[PDB]
Amino acid sequence: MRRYEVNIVLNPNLDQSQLALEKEIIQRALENYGARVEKVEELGLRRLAYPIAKDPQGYFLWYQVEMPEDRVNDLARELRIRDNVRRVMVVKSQEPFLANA
Amino acid sequence: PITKEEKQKVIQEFARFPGDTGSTEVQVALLTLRINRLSEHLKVHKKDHHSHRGLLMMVGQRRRLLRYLQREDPERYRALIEKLGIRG
Amino acid sequence: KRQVASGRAYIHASYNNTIVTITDPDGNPITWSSGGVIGYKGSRKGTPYAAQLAALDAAKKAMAYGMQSVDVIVRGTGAGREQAIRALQASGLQVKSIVDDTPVPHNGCRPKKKFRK
Amino acid sequence: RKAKVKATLGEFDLRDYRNVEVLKRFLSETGKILPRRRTGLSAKEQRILAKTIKRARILGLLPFTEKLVRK
RNA sequence: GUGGGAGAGGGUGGUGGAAUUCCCGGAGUAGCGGUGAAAUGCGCAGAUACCGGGAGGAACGCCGAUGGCGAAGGCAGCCACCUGGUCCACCCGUGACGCUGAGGCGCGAAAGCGUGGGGAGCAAACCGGAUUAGAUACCCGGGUAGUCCACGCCCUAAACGAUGCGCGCUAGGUCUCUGGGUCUCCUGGGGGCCGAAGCUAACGCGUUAAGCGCGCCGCCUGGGGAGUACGGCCGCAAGGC
Ligand SMILES: [Mg+2]
Ligand SMILES: [Mg+2]
Ligand SMILES: [Mg+2]
Ligand SMILES: [Mg+2]
Ligand SMILES: [Mg+2]
Ligand SMILES: [Mg+2]
Ligand SMILES: [Mg+2]
Ligand SMILES: [Mg+2]
Ligand SMILES: [Mg+2]
Ligand SMILES: [Mg+2]
Ligand SMILES: [Mg+2]
Ligand SMILES: [Mg+2]
Ligand SMILES: [Mg+2]
Ligand SMILES: [Mg+2]
Ligand SMILES: [Mg+2]
Ligand SMILES: [Mg+2]
Ligand SMILES: [Mg+2]
Ligand SMILES: [Mg+2]
Ligand SMILES: [Mg+2]
Ligand SMILES: [Mg+2]
Ligand SMILES: [Mg+2]
Ligand SMILES: [Mg+2]
Ligand SMILES: [Mg+2]
Ligand SMILES: [Mg+2]
Ligand SMILES: [Mg+2]
Ligand SMILES: [Mg+2]
Ligand SMILES: [Mg+2]
Ligand SMILES: [Mg+2]
Ligand SMILES: [Mg+2]
Ligand SMILES: [Mg+2]
Ligand SMILES: [Mg+2]
Ligand SMILES: [Mg+2]
Ligand SMILES: [Mg+2]
Ligand SMILES: [Mg+2]
Ligand SMILES: [Mg+2]
Ligand SMILES: [Mg+2]
Ligand SMILES: [Mg+2]
Ligand SMILES: [Mg+2]
Ligand SMILES: [Mg+2]
Ligand SMILES: [Mg+2]
Ligand SMILES: [Mg+2]
Ligand SMILES: [Mg+2]
Ligand SMILES: [Mg+2]
Ligand SMILES: [Mg+2]
Ligand SMILES: [Mg+2]
Ligand SMILES: [Mg+2]
Ligand SMILES: [Mg+2]
Ligand SMILES: [Mg+2]
Ligand SMILES: [Mg+2]
Ligand SMILES: [Mg+2]
Ligand SMILES: [Mg+2]
Ligand SMILES: [Mg+2]
Ligand SMILES: [Mg+2]
Ligand SMILES: [Mg+2]
Ligand SMILES: [Mg+2]
Ligand SMILES: [Mg+2]
Ligand SMILES: [Mg+2]
Ligand SMILES: [Mg+2]
Ligand SMILES: [Mg+2]
């Protein structure tokens, strides 16, 4: 396995049932694609840069995972099928490279 | 790729002794490993030509190493070939 | 005949001509004018003066239409753009914010041979 | 000839596409990503900062382009 | 071998914004476009300019560099996978396993061919407008192949550093990419510039040689005739050797 990060920007207008349900679909996708989750940081909704889906802001999740290399893509494929998911970004996770320590 | 594990296992196999890494036999095994990996790569991707270059080279090396081993000790050559099973 | 009174002024400035379009806070136009909306016919619509007279047409028109404050926006690089904004400076209109919008692409489309290299 | 970007900032992960005002501090008054002349990074530094910014833009975190004010 | 590294190196699948074009709608009116000046074109079936929505294609602004990678041709948004090369440090393993390379095999920009898709912007040919002594042209308005994709052919080039590959040897200075150091600095590996000795017809080259050497391949033998003729070979053809 390798350790990726998964960003999810989804519909800022979600009520609670709806939100916990998109979250549920996410859990399920991850299990079904083989990713163990080593962390979550959900900053929730934030003011955007440029409109996305005609919307001014977006609801933010971040998931640090470790999963099967060859499956990563299919996972993203799947994560994206929700209309209520706006943008999905997966990344092989690197190590902090800083400057001015 | 090729894991740490896998490379290890193939040497911890073909080594003339404990600690052997650079033996003619071993290199030949590696190069075959690597080769087969890449050939299967170009089973799909018949369009990745720049990797093909590499295949050609890795093949050349394998061949010289073999030829040398033959020149030197025909015995371990037959044995090696009759393990990896290629061109003999 | 709505009495707008606050709005946008759009200066579109090409090597060949200039157009002011006055619109409302929502962008729907209120009035407008140009090189050859005023007299001028050929190239002559490019001259900056053309731009002044045009800008002032667009103002005066909009001003009887009831407008005072406007927000300037400017598309294109071309002679007497500045002159057009100038015209607006004292048009009688309060020029609230000038702004530059000229579309640049990120290299999509293949230019007409005139604009290549 | 004002003063250079990195000089302001403290230590920062140059890989953070989540982290903004640190990031936005690298862009023009238009979206435009900033010249080394202006940012004062290194070959490698600027190089990573690029992909970082771009990664972030795609995320809707940073602006692809902006309007220019006055003129 | 082990441990690090940088990279538009290759293939695949995905996806992101900006702009063009077209379609829908709002508002709005008389011209826009275009040039040296113009006209053709477009516009009351309401254009242009403006706002909102939508489709589709092609290419990736800033970063971008005097930068990087690649054997060459060449390679630029971001993501993930598949993979090639290459550099360094430790000085661990094999023990001359090396260099070159006629044939052969593979790659090979663009244009071009075949079959089937796709077709926004562009645009040979072509249709027009103007300029001109005329204008089978330079400027302007249209426009088809084609540019894009898949597959299969084509095999050319100012395919340029007009500089074959390998190794060893011969002052330095300086700018830079990328490693490793005890890190103003030393040490590798690339990219540039000045310049020792030397070379050179000159211009120039000069540790990235065009210097001093050895190996090996390719090639030259006055200008035309001519990369023509004939023959052979490949090619569907164009044509190539
Ligand atoms: Mg979606
Ligand atoms: Mg004009
Ligand atoms: Mg055209
Ligand atoms: Mg390694
Ligand atoms: Mg690449
Ligand atoms: Mg690639
Ligand atoms: Mg791709
Ligand atoms: Mg668009
Ligand atoms: Mg309309
Ligand atoms: Mg003339
Ligand atoms: Mg008419
Ligand atoms: Mg008409
Ligand atoms: Mg009517
Ligand atoms: Mg629109
Ligand atoms: Mg679409
Ligand atoms: Mg269409
Ligand atoms: Mg679209
Ligand atoms: Mg190179
Ligand atoms: Mg070239
Ligand atoms: Mg690699
Ligand atoms: Mg030893
Ligand atoms: Mg020994
Ligand atoms: Mg060779
Ligand atoms: Mg050959
Ligand atoms: Mg070719
Ligand atoms: Mg082509
Ligand atoms: Mg033909
Ligand atoms: Mg034309
Ligand atoms: Mg003509
Ligand atoms: Mg003529
Ligand atoms: Mg003519
Ligand atoms: Mg002329
Ligand atoms: Mg045809
Ligand atoms: Mg074709
Ligand atoms: Mg093809
Ligand atoms: Mg030649
Ligand atoms: Mg040679
Ligand atoms: Mg050769
Ligand atoms: Mg050559
Ligand atoms: Mg020679
Ligand atoms: Mg060699
Ligand atoms: Mg040498
Ligand atoms: Mg130097
Ligand atoms: Mg260092
Ligand atoms: Mg150096
Ligand atoms: Mg010199
Ligand atoms: Mg001398
Ligand atoms: Mg030396
Ligand atoms: Mg050097
Ligand atoms: Mg010479
Ligand atoms: Mg002769
Ligand atoms: Mg002759
Ligand atoms: Mg010829
Ligand atoms: Mg013949
Ligand atoms: Mg004959
Ligand atoms: Mg053949
Ligand atoms: Mg024949
Ligand atoms: Mg010919
Ligand atoms: Mg040939």
From Swiss-Prot, chain A:
Pfam families: Ribosomal_S6 (PF01250). One of its GO terms (biological process) is translation. One of its GO terms (molecular function) is small ribosomal subunit rRNA binding. GO terms for cellular component: cytoplasm; ribonucleoprotein complex; ribosome. Keywords: Ribonucleoprotein, Ribosomal protein, RNA-binding, rRNA-binding. It comes from the Bacteria. HAMAP family: Ribosomal_bS6. NCBIfam families: S6. Part of the 30S ribosomal subunit. Forms a tight heterodimer with protein bS18. May make transient contacts with protein uL2 of the 50S subunit during translation. Located on the outer edge of the platform on the body of the 30S subunit. Belongs to the bacterial ribosomal protein bS6 family. This is Small ribosomal subunit protein bS6.
Curated annotation (Swiss-Prot), chain B:
It comes from the Bacteria. PROSITE patterns: RIBOSOMAL_S15. The keyword Ligase does not apply. Part of the 30S ribosomal subunit. Forms a bridge to the 50S subunit in the 70S ribosome, contacting the 23S rRNA. One of the primary rRNA binding proteins, it binds directly to 16S rRNA where it helps nucleate assembly of the platform of the 30S subunit by binding and bridging several RNA helices of the 16S rRNA. Belongs to the universal ribosomal protein uS15 family. This is Small ribosomal subunit protein uS15.
UniProtKB/Swiss-Prot annotation, chain C:
InterPro entries: Ribosomal_uS11, Ribosomal_uS11_bac-type, Ribosomal_uS11_CS, Ribosomal_uS11_sf. GO terms for biological process: translation. The keyword Acetylation does not apply. GO terms for molecular function: rRNA binding; structural constituent of ribosome. Keywords: Ribonucleoprotein, Ribosomal protein, RNA-binding, rRNA-binding. Residues 109-117 have a biased composition (Basic residues). It holds the Pfam family Ribosomal_S11. It comes from the Bacteria. GO terms for cellular component: ribonucleoprotein complex; ribosome. Residues 99-117 are annotated as: Disordered. PANTHER family: 40S RIBOSOMAL PROTEIN S14/30S RIBOSOMAL PROTEIN S11. Located on the upper part of the platform of the 30S subunit, where it bridges several disparate RNA helices of the 16S rRNA. Forms part of the Shine-Dalgarno cleft in the 70S ribosome, where it interacts both with the Shine-Dalgarno helix and mRNA. Part of the 30S ribosomal subunit. Interacts with proteins S7 and S18. Binds to the C-terminus of IF-3; however exactly how IF-3 interacts with the 30S subunit is unclear. May contact the C-terminus of Era. Belongs to the universal ribosomal protein uS11 family. This is Small ribosomal subunit protein uS11. It comes from Thermus thermophilus (strain ATCC 27634 / DSM 579 / HB8). The gene is rpsK.
Curated annotation (Swiss-Prot), chain D:
It comes from the Bacteria. The keyword Ribonucleoprotein applies. GO terms for biological process: translation. GO terms for cellular component: ribonucleoprotein complex; ribosome. Belongs to the bacterial ribosomal protein bS18 family. Part of the 30S ribosomal subunit. Forms a tight heterodimer with protein bS6, also interacts with protein uS11. Binds to the C-terminus of IF3 and to the central section of Era. Located on the back of the platform of the 30S subunit where it stabilizes the close packing of several RNA helices of the 16S rRNA. Forms part of the Shine-Dalgarno cleft in the 70S ribosome, where it probably interacts with the Shine-Dalgarno helix. This is Small ribosomal subunit protein bS18. It comes from Thermus thermophilus (strain ATCC 27634 / DSM 579 / HB8). The chain holds residues 18 to 88 of 88 of the full protein.
